[PDB]
């Protein structure tokens, strides 16, 4: 017997489709090839990334842990395997008692005594009704959940090396950013000063000036700390040093992430590792349901012999002092004062939890994705605005300083463009930073980079 | 006998006032409807969340686990009550050994045997100093515990369902606003297009305008990306789709909340559930201290008999092969190394630390009502100043435009006055956003929303 | 014998030298007295933060339970400890049994029995391999790195005490920087207002001056809150109310905290605690390999007699009814189906495991640190270009205000300058917080405030 429940996987309890709305792109159905296959290699454009969540694979602490903790459980999975299968030792015995006059063999105070090196078995259970088997199979749902798990912790570093990269990049374009900008600043104070000098530009002019240039220096040392916190980030996540002869990488301009499909939600189900995580928890409580319903069925024991027993140590090795036992032991439970029903009530509800973290997994992993395509479908026209707005800006500002410098028109208006560009232009990166972000985590949220290549 | 130790509720750690300064209305003092009994249903004014709460608490997988445990841990009060009643069995056992001569029956190697079917107990512990009962009741405390926890979640699921649709609402208004407020920067642009046409109107003038329609584009895809995530929020915490007929809900300017009195920090020891979470993880702490007590004392064992018993197993249902047992074991201990007095030790220190977490979570509720007070104090003055600043700068706005439009001033005011008025009603948004949320939260940190109903 | 392995401290997977770059000072090489000896009497120059850390450390229920729980490891060690000592009690036994005449010492159906108080051991595990003393050296690395846990614990502790304690005078700046503000708002709309009426200013100027007075209101009433739950949460943290005869604190502007030295990455681990604390686990693991070994080799085992036994309860203490049992049992496994080896396999993967924990948390610690100094090397830059910012801001107002006063300039003008000067002495109290809660945290990175005084 196996009283092990048939497994039914239960029902998506998520939309058959992907939302609509104003922010999301058309549905794109079905995809030939899930995002769950592309390769990483593939995905990441940037061969210097690539070279980094390659380092991070082979040497992050946290991946490491998830990687000997499915060892961890297939060791437990071979602890229930062998119990089905009996231990046998050399048993070497020995009593040696005095009992009074009225229980001894004499009617006198005597002082027996045996002795009995065996080979055999003590207790074994016999496993008819399946209470071992089953919590063997429940052992071995559990060593595949953690299977699951090394998978989604691969996925979830992916993404964070991904997103550490993008951030340092990002930061340092804002650093670069920044040195240019102080740099014009300082040159329009100098030729502001200048004028001052010479009877035409105001104390006020100056004064103005002086406040982008200190302004400007502060985001200069701002963006100087965030850059280095950022290397520091990375190097804890690819869990050793930066190489020292990576390729070359790619600005934030040029195209880093190759398009991943949509797919349909149902994918999710035989494609996303927590949610396959989640089925083998599920399957695994399902198991333990078998072990549970055993323990009212009748149960048969075994201890088994050979050896030699004497009457005194010395006569343990001589000829004929041959023994052996054999002692078999049904049980059938009849009376639990209900307890056998409650570790049966138990067992169940612990399986109605796993159903319900279950289709958690599958509602959580549909939120995600969903955001993913909110990010996808709104972040095109983000940026195409910001880029018209750093334009704008840009043409405001060539203008403000034209007919600043002709006496034309006032500093405020100078300091107004020049503000107006310094932020848009760092908005600019940092939507694109967020813009990528959002990809790389709806890349991890469909299925993520388990894979190196893509898989046929 | 019951070991367990007296148990006196520990003194609350925490001021008998809620806290005073400028940031806090006058304290209410007692109340007489606690906030704890106040039922959501009453305390948000919105039909639509009332109906969304309700299906979130249907459909929810959080709060579905949470009720799953405390059937997990009845299961477990049951099987510790159990163990005070005999296991009752019907146990065939069956010896067959080969012993030598000098250990024989006749002195020469022989081979003995036994059969038995019998029906009786094995090793009950009779409770006389109360072990098996002090482990049950430390059973029942932790079922009440994890009732008071699931009480607990539900409180969290209706702050975050509450909390995602005003999230979501604000999102609404800020799109919506910003939707309008593109309308008037195109329109202004094109005013200021006919006008650069026609001679009037700078180039400078221009690029100002065309900034302000740019940044509104960029605004207008954020809040399209925001609106729709906020959705997808929504959506997991209900754990199913949103509803296809629901009442119509309220504006952020209308009344959404019942007013909820502040009662006395005493109240949270008789009324927030984490609290009494808390409680009975300490007697149940408490509990166990029995158990270990009762390891010193003696322990009464029992074996039980009836059956009938053979040399064959041919004899087995034949007359007056009738069988029985009878076997009492009292056992005092009187040597451990100490093992007992550490376990005792170990049992002590747990209920230590079951006392300072117990303090610890009314701490946690004092700084969190507190706090909701401080919001409560403080929102209806910042609110009132935010308006006050809508106000102003939409006269100031007006003016502005007509001033540009009249050739009396320049485009630089009337954008100063445009950004203005934008970022003062985005804020005005954001504001009664947090101050909706303090409530929410402080309504579920003094005992939440467990009754649907007013409790009377 | 002990069949744990030898332990080889892992090698420490950093750097030799904490980075370099544009955002650090050089490296300061070996500390002559090392961060982690520095007491927080010392490092926090604050008298009134020295008192309330003081309060934490006696009242801080979570830091209670950290100690509560180095004494639960102690009593748990204390368990394994007597684990290697014989178990004494008084066994008093009794069977009474029918058997049939085929079983009987007489040939019909018989009624025997037995009694028998004794003094001895039951199944006294004898420690030749080691199975006990390596769990009991486990049990002692595990109280070890609990020890390490708390010290841990007090340092998070620390550091956020005076982390509270900072946002607190910081917010308390900001509600006071806001209180002057709003006042000169104030007195700049009523002069306004008086040249609007003479006349003179326009309705737009007054409008302008209306909206700086506004949004001033709105930032007050924000920081009266801020300011208000500050409070909540450094009561909180102090585990009760606060003191009500406080020395007199430091404001911003002084000097708060000792410069602590870098030291070399190879000191965090001997000085970081939840290194240590990992190292402990390690060793704990290390120990357990041991218990895994000796399951393979030969295990004895023995029970002890003397007492007094019977035939009937009435000759129990009856002379010569003296009884004593004398029983060893050595057992080599033989076959098990690989459980053994598997049970090994688990004990060493999990020491696998707790390498890479090591490793991590040294990699983590080398991470904070790194990012301690990378604000250490930015902090003063910023601060002082923020600095000058303000002077340059203060500078535009006052030429801003006359400029309006006297009819030669604008309000948009003065507008501008307000709010210049505003946002750039509320981010200059922003910076200074967040550079002192850098170096906070660098010191507990370092190996934190555990001595009270510094250690020589």
């Known amino acids: 017997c196996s009283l092990i429940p048939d497994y039914q996987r239960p029902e998506a309890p998520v939309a058959a489709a992907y939302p609509q709305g104003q922010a999301y792109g058309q549905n794109t159905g079905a995809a030939a090839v899930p995002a769950a296959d592309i390769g990483w290699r593939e995905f990441f454009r940037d061969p210097q990334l ?28 071979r602890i229930q395997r062998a119990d089905l299968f009996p231990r046998i030792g050399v048993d070497g015995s020995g009593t040696r008692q005095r009992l009074p006059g009225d229980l001894s063999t004499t009617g006198s105070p005597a002082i027996s005594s045996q002795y009995g090196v065996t080979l055999g078995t003590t207790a074994w259970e016999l496993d008819l009704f399946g209470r071992l088997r089953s919590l063997r199979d429940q052992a071995l749902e559990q060593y595949l959940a953690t299977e699951q798990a090394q998978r989604s912790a691969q996925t979830t570093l992916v993404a964070s090396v991904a997103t550490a990269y993008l951030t340092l990049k990002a930061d340092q374009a804002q650093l670069q950013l920044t040195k240019d900008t102080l740099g014009t600043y300082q040159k329009s104070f100098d030729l ?27 985001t200069l040392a701002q963006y100087t700390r965030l850059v280095a916190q950022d290397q520091n980030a990375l190097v804890l996540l ?14 934030l301009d040029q195209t880093l992430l190759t398009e991943v499909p949509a797919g349909l939600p149902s994918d999710l189900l035989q494609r996303r590792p927590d949610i396959l995580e989640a089925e083998h928890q599920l399957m695994a409580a399902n198991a333990s349901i078998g072990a549970a319903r055993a323990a009212f069925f009748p149960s048969i024991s075994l201890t088994a012999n050979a050896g030699t027993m004497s009457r005194q140590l010395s006569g343990l090795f001589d000829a004929g002092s041959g023994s052996w036992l054999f002692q078999p032991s049904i049980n059938l439970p009849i009376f639990t004062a209900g307890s056998l029903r409650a570790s049966l009530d138990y067992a169940k509800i612990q399986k109605d939890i796993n159903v319900a973290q279950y289709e958690k997994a599958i509602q959580t992993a549909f939120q995600e994705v969903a955001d993913g395509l909110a990010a ?10 910001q880029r018209d707005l750093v334009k704008a800006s ?34 600019l990166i940092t939507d694109r930073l967020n813009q990528l972000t959002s990809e790389v985590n709806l890349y991890k949220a469909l299925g993520g980079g388990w894979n190196q290549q893509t898989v046929t």
Chains 1, 2, 3 share one sequence.
């Open 192 to 218: 502001t000063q200048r004028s001052y000098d010479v009877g035409v530009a105001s104390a006020l002019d100056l004064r103005q000036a002086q406040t982008a240039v200190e302004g400007a220096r502060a």
């Open 376 to 385: 996808r479908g709104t972040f095109t026209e983000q940026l195409q605005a």
């Open 50 to 77: 690539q070279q980094l969540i390659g380092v991070a694979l082979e040497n992050n602490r946290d991946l490491r842990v998830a990687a000997l903790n499915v060892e961890a459980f297939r060791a437990q999975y």
């Open 238 to 251: 690819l869990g050793s040093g930066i190489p020292a002869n990576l390729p070359q990488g790619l600005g």
């Open 394 to 427: 840009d043409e405001y500002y060539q203008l403000a300083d034209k007919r600043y410098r002709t006496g034309v028109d006032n500093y405020l208006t100078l300091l107004d463009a020049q503000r107006s560009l310094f932020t848009a232009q760092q908005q």
